[PDB]
């Protein structure tokens, strides 16, 4: 049912841009929450990364992956604005003559900046719990944040592609089912996949660098490196979202 | 995107609460009691696990603990009973939405809080009578955890409670946005897995923690003035996460003019 | 929604006493099965107890509790007469003016005996499988039946209270959801909670003592010690089922 | 509600026999598929039993049980003819005046033989894969076949009884719910129990022996010993299925 | 309920060829995603194999099977064209007189070549991430591709069969249920069964070899060996898929 799906997608895009043109406050607040949601998932899996790494476990990355489902499940189940997901919706709705190229440009920028705000808000709050004053978890953040800002642009860009392919395909999946359960399971599988395989998610990283740059202990990485990671991964996501999933669902769901 | 339809569902839920309180206090407390005892049953389970595993020196203890805490909020959702931390978002949202007053909110918060506590007290007492926390790893787990929580800076507890309710209320929010019960349970399971393992603080869960520690004859790491210090700051944290975050969010996203 | 549920419970209660006043065969044959169904859960988690204990792992209690779900899941899905569950139904239905004190006591007695007959039959058959001729499993039974029969009264009594709160609250959930899957998930969590936490269920114990008594491989049993545990635990279940859940569901769901 | 189920069963029995009298091809082809489907489950959990026993694991049997769900999940979800299941269905239908005693015997004889053809075909093909040319799995196969063909008749008979009580009770559940998801979860719990507990399924054993015999590695099997196990368990199965489940479902769901 | 299913199947077949006859771009792009989706499943379970292998674990093969569901799940939920699935559909469709032999061979050819386009695309992108420049994963990819290539034709062939009997029987299931969750669960089981059992999947192998050839690590892969495996496995699938499931779902479902 590609036609029915492409239509759903396009409506989604129109609804998004409509919200933005109606209330920037509403759209920013909705995106803020999606960032805090994806971020919560990060906090869970780095807390797991810490516990399991300190204990020298081979299962660390598998378990970290199995436990990330909450990040996207919360976003999908609350109907909040996540930038990575708008990479497919805006483009798919754009090729379908439902939204302009500006519309897409505007939703991407606002959803992005909006997601960042949720991540910064979460960062400060977590930091204030003490839970990263020192120890295995605190360190797991510092090291990870360093690893990522230290990788080749090509490596990130491509990691970013494979990631948003998985994310958007689970979003597409939710558009093609009525089972909120099936929705969640598919999100579970895709995040399990993208997390454990080592792909890069622009928004989830906002929480990673948010907590680092806001933590006292963490001296390891600069703000300039956080921008290099987000930009290289962002571009990667955009490609994997718009140029693969966006264009793909349109091609499969046109009618002449 | 179905925010108006939901903010409505919320604003209605808020009304039914203050309505229930106003027609029968026996009914509102007895409900709040079963909720506290339900959230507490969840603490009995994961603290038993917390004990078996720490005594064995496993690195998976906090992970397995968070995973098993699902029963706490699941019972409360599936029975439709009054939980204080859940009303932080409902009453809050229903208030901003011109459905209930500030007086109603603080009435429901108080009666459900004091109500949940009765649930904990009854549970703890009964749990002690089972003899399961006379001695051993579990007793030691309650004893040690009770002390760690009572001896943390105010700010730490405060923020730990904020992140907790954002998760607890959001799982509730999810339940107002789906007709699948299975979907409801899963999301609760995920949100609880997150807040437990991440090390966040839930006031009504702590009532069973302190209920059991203080009531146990052999567990003295406690201090009632300590349990109060915790329950107050964590509760403050929960209200800020439930009302100022989720409550205010569900409304800002739900209005129309 | 408590009016509908309380009404719903009262109807269940009235059906039970109707079935018993209509056919004692049907009601004992339905109780025997519910006993033998819960008993099956025991045979599983004790076979699991023998293997994990003999090997001495910490997870033993946790795995056992996660595996007991089948016990009450068969009872609910087959729709058969479990004594512990009748503590809430008959209790609430009675308070709601639908059933009489005499009706409650009959349904309580007849399902108890019936459940027991259920376990006796399971025991004999299990004994004949040889699965308990000697080794970890038969040892886990022997060892477990001892401690249960050597615990102070109040301990069992309270343990029985907490058990039937969980067992009945899962039964309650199966009255508040149209999703059969959601039913099974809730039973799962409740049975996981009460098993791993070390609470006492009377019907399940009939199977424990059924095997320990029929198996040649002795025990620190002595029947008299089995009647002591079954009597003290049953009273606990009754209090937890009737006084807590039964009366609780009534108070929340009356109308004036 | 039991006549509404007892009715479903009686209709299921009438349709089974209607199929046999309409196409001995269709009924066999269906039974051979059920047999092969169940065997497929065996191939998985013996591949597991081989991996885990070799490494000396205390979890071996527990993981085996947890993974055997696929066996009956294909037979129920595809609607194919399984002998063990026909014990309760044909039995209950025969007691409810739906089908005759000769009807019950044809269905039983054919489905049984049909299931064997499935196992044989699967057995052959599996051997051709080379996965039993030598090693842990092959050893687990030949080892388990022996132990089974070496146990007293009684043991097998009683194991067969408890095995079918469980396999049939899950088949009953699938008659008592409209949730396909629920149907599966229940099959999962029932097989988990009977596998891990130590009970004997006659059709699953066909594949166990199919492989052991057709397998290039000597044996220690003796085909005359394989028949001993299949007769012992099959009879155990019949009792468990017919006398217990069949008779119980009829008794609980009559109308006078 | 096979008539209705055979009808449903014959319809899928008619739609597939219709799609191909109406737009080669739509069809190939649809097959490109199916291959890439199945490939993502491989990327996941080889990342898992690399980690657990390097840590020397006996559970590795078991954890790989449990984590492969995302492969056929993404495909069934996006409604995309996977060659191994068309072995059954086109077979049953043909025998039921909905499509021709020419129609069949076109669908087979185009999906297979379409799936390969997807493998090659996933390959390039994945290697571009550095996640296989060197290490346990990279070495795992290399090592598995070598084993597969260096295996007798008869072995690969028979494993291709059993693999597709499961891949297809899961597609058959998705045709028989309306529970989307039940569809995923059943796929999860079937992919668990064939991965852990050690069976051979043509399309999954496409990404294995796609990554082993673009990958920097030197090994014993040999292109002539990749074609030898792809061919001998492809065949195996065609047989188990068409000669087994196709013909079976036809025989059980025709009407006279
Ligand atoms: C906290 C306030 C956030 C405001 C974010 C607005 C940033 C807009 O950014 C611009 O928006 C244009 C359309 O308006 C697009 O055409 C441009 O591509 C984009 O850069
Ligand atoms: C047995 C439990 C009794 C609980 C009684 C709680 C009564 C709360 O009463 C409320 O208190 C608020 C302050 O918290 C005030 O702002 C409100 O005006 C007042 O109505
Ligand atoms: C073969 C098994 C037969 C069991 C029949 C049990 C009959 C129980 O009968 C009931 O016993 C109660 C107390 O036990 C009494 O309070 C009731 O008055 C009485 O009807
Ligand atoms: Zn349209
Ligand atoms: Zn309104
Ligand atoms: Zn009424
Ligand atoms: Zn009739
Ligand atoms: Zn037709």
mmCIF file with all atom_site columns, C-alpha atoms in Angstrom, chain A residues 181, chain B residues 77-78 175 178-188, chain C residues 173 176-179 182-183 185:
data_model
loop_
_atom_site.group_PDB
_atom_site.id
_atom_site.type_symbol
_atom_site.label_atom_id
_atom_site.label_alt_id
_atom_site.label_comp_id
_atom_site.label_asym_id
_atom_site.label_entity_id
_atom_site.label_seq_id
_atom_site.pdbx_PDB_ins_code
_atom_site.Cartn_x
_atom_site.Cartn_y
_atom_site.Cartn_z
_atom_site.occupancy
_atom_site.B_iso_or_equiv
_atom_site.pdbx_formal_charge
_atom_site.auth_seq_id
_atom_site.auth_comp_id
_atom_site.auth_asym_id
_atom_site.auth_atom_id
_atom_site.pdbx_PDB_model_num
ATOM 1  C CA . UNK A 1 181 ? 2.421   -2.487  19.556 1.00 0.00 ? 181 UNK A CA 1
ATOM 2  C CA . UNK B 2 77  ? -2.723  1.898   35.084 1.00 0.00 ? 77  UNK B CA 1
ATOM 3  C CA . UNK B 2 78  ? -4.624  -1.376  34.638 1.00 0.00 ? 78  UNK B CA 1
ATOM 4  C CA . UNK B 2 175 ? -1.782  5.501   27.933 1.00 0.00 ? 175 UNK B CA 1
ATOM 5  C CA . UNK B 2 178 ? -3.405  4.543   22.635 1.00 0.00 ? 178 UNK B CA 1
ATOM 6  C CA . UNK B 2 179 ? -6.251  2.032   22.755 1.00 0.00 ? 179 UNK B CA 1
ATOM 7  C CA . UNK B 2 180 ? -3.902  -0.939  22.908 1.00 0.00 ? 180 UNK B CA 1
ATOM 8  C CA . UNK B 2 181 ? -3.437  -2.078  26.497 1.00 0.00 ? 181 UNK B CA 1
ATOM 9  C CA . UNK B 2 182 ? -0.416  -4.131  25.470 1.00 0.00 ? 182 UNK B CA 1
ATOM 10 C CA . UNK B 2 183 ? 1.046   -0.954  23.979 1.00 0.00 ? 183 UNK B CA 1
ATOM 11 C CA . UNK B 2 184 ? 0.322   0.809   27.292 1.00 0.00 ? 184 UNK B CA 1
ATOM 12 C CA . UNK B 2 185 ? 2.122   -1.809  29.369 1.00 0.00 ? 185 UNK B CA 1
ATOM 13 C CA . UNK B 2 186 ? 5.141   -1.860  27.053 1.00 0.00 ? 186 UNK B CA 1
ATOM 14 C CA . UNK B 2 187 ? 5.643   1.916   27.252 1.00 0.00 ? 187 UNK B CA 1
ATOM 15 C CA . UNK B 2 188 ? 5.348   1.848   31.033 1.00 0.00 ? 188 UNK B CA 1
ATOM 16 C CA . UNK C 3 173 ? -6.870  -7.024  35.289 1.00 0.00 ? 173 UNK C CA 1
ATOM 17 C CA . UNK C 3 176 ? -10.612 -4.778  32.960 1.00 0.00 ? 176 UNK C CA 1
ATOM 18 C CA . UNK C 3 177 ? -9.072  -5.459  29.552 1.00 0.00 ? 177 UNK C CA 1
ATOM 19 C CA . UNK C 3 178 ? -10.418 -6.899  26.307 1.00 0.00 ? 178 UNK C CA 1
ATOM 20 C CA . UNK C 3 179 ? -6.890  -7.751  25.167 1.00 0.00 ? 179 UNK C CA 1
ATOM 21 C CA . UNK C 3 182 ? -2.543  -7.827  27.932 1.00 0.00 ? 182 UNK C CA 1
ATOM 22 C CA . UNK C 3 183 ? -4.169  -10.332 30.293 1.00 0.00 ? 183 UNK C CA 1
ATOM 23 C CA . UNK C 3 185 ? 1.376   -10.020 30.283 1.00 0.00 ? 185 UNK C CA 1
#
